């Protein structure tokens, strides 16, 4: 006989409603009196926050603050769903990394900076740039967390799909009582931990200064473009993600390793004015393994060059139709604490350019795999070594939706810096 939905006990109905997407709850709520009333049951929304946005709200916190999960879903989670993820700020050539994330009754824009040069194995430093706070009865507030004088008014604008912007409404807080000299030393201390001096090298001294001045011009009014972590694959792979790498005088840069057939790509997440954020910095030819000779041939620079240009050669013909390691004499390395065993070597090419990314080109070199989360690149024509090491942090909402989508994201961030 002819039962309807409307005759089911409330408890069954809650089961069923608690199982649906949160975005279907608001239609159900407008169907009738009984559904509106039932949909005031927080358990339903507490499940919707957990399963869809990863957040398990505290009940005690909910009681103190007077906020409910219906509120959280509606006014925080869904309202702001599009800025969640992993981002790269648009800051001329320098990039950056923001992971925008849900904690409790907050959404937090976390900036991840590299460790001090040259300590590529030290962990990423991290600080909030902005937060979004839900309180009882109110719309969620937007606040900027830069830089030293506490949280203060901000704005957010979701431009599209894959871009958003922050404004700060009260920059009086970024300032410091000593002035801009002091802003500069604290900044120097956190990014370098070196003395306003120590290095002497006017060149790094100059690069550091200019970067300070260029980025600090974005007070902190920035636009962010979406980026993704690279797809895991079992065979055609030995372990992607983000690494921290030595880039000489520019200091440490963040580089995303990803796999693309029998070829790996090194993509800049942060960069410098020679080769900017968003560009291919490295490419590893994964079918042109190079054999590691004994250790006194390893020491021989020219042996190494002959061998590497001979592979360059054979590569150019086609596109027509652990164990002891040491750098060669003449090859510099900012680190010196690069491992003395390695598994494999492979031919690869780096991207080089003059200042302003002028007249870029691929120079030969050789990629060196040390550990699961440690590798290097010998820059032949610069007689120079780069040591990369895995960024150990973990990132929320950062996965490409699909593989072709990741290869699209690479294409967009490369083009904005073309």
């Amino acid at each position: 006989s002819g039962r309807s939905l409307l005759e089911l006990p409330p408890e069954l109905l809650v089961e069923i409603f608690a199982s649906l997407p949160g975005t279907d709850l608001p239609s159900l709520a407008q169907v009738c009196t009984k559904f509106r009333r039932i949909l005031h049951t927080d358990t339903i929304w507490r499940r919707r926050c957990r399963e869809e946005y990863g957040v398990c709200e505290n009940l005690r916190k909910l009681e103190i603050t007077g906020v409910s999960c219906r509120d959280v879903y509606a006014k925080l989670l869904h309202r702001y769903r599009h800025i969640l993820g992993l981002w790269q700020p648009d800051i001329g050539p320098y990039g950056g990394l923001l992971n925008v994330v849900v904690d409790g009754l907050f959404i937090i824009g976390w900036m991840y900076l590299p460790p001090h040069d040259p300590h590529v194995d030290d962990p990423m430093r991290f600080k909030p740039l902005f937060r979004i706070h839900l309180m009882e009865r109110k719309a969620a507030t937007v606040e900027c967390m830069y830089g030293h004088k506490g949280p203060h008014h901000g704005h957010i604008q979701i431009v599209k799909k894959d871009e958003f912007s922050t404004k700060c409404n009260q920059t009086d807080h970024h300032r410091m009582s000593g002035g801009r000299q002091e802003e500069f030393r604290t900044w120097l201390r956190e990014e370098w931990g070196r003395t306003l001096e120590d290095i002497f090298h006017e060149h790094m001294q100059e690069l550091i200064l200019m970067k300070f001045i260029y980025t600090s011009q974005y007070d902190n009014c920035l636009t962010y473009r979406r980026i993704y972590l690279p797809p895991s694959r079992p065979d055609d792979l030995i372990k992607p993600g983000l690494f921290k790498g030595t880039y000489g005088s520019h200091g440490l840069e963040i580089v995303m390793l990803s796999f693309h057939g029998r070829r790996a790509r090194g993509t800049k997440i942060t960069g410098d004015p020679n080769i900017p954020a968003g560009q291919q910095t490295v490419e590893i030819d994964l079918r042109h393994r190079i054999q590691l000779p004994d250790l006194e041939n390893q020491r021989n620079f020219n042996e190494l060059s002959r061998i590497v240009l001979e592979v360059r050669e054979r590569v150019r013909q086609e596109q027509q139709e652990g164990q002891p390691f040491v750098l060669p004499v003449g090859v510099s390395s900012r680190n010196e604490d690069y491992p003395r065993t390695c598994r494999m070597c492979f031919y690869g090419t780096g991207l080089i350019a003059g200042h302003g990314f002028t007249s870029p080109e691929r120079t030969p070199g050789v990629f060196i795999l040390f550990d699961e989360d440690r590798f290097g690149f010998v820059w032949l024509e610069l007689k120079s070594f780069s040591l990369y090491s895995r960024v150990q942090a973990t990132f929320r909402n950062a996965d490409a939706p699909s593989p072709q989508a990741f290869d699209e994201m690479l294409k967009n961030i490369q083009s904005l810096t073309s």
């Binding site: 309807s4 409307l6 159900l28 169907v31 009738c32």
Partner: protein, 145 residues
Amino acid sequence: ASIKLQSSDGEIFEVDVEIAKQSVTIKTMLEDLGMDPVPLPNVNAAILKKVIQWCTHHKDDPGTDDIPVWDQEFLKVDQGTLFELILAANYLDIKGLLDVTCKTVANMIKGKTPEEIRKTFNIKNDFTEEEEAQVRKENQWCEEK
């Protein structure tokens, strides 16, 4: 190997013990209360039948979240029967059947507007003019983008 089940309206069913005990309710009535036959005053005979088919299909069971075909087919019935199954499955405590009958209702709601939901399930709009204005407002946030 066999016990007797009694429908709300008198019909008796000889069912295998281990099939019957997928219903935790029955298993309690048989073991703890010693009933044989087990009167099910809330489940009519046509419904009991289907519930015995289901449990029997599912007798061996080591699930996922996506409705197996065999069960989709079992559920190609009319609404009223689908809700009688939900209620029967709630009364008898058969988790698998409850789950699968409820997911099924839920897929019938997935993405519908309030209008389409009322027509699907014949629910009368019982809001007053004010209340309805009020629900609309309370739920604007969903058309945010």
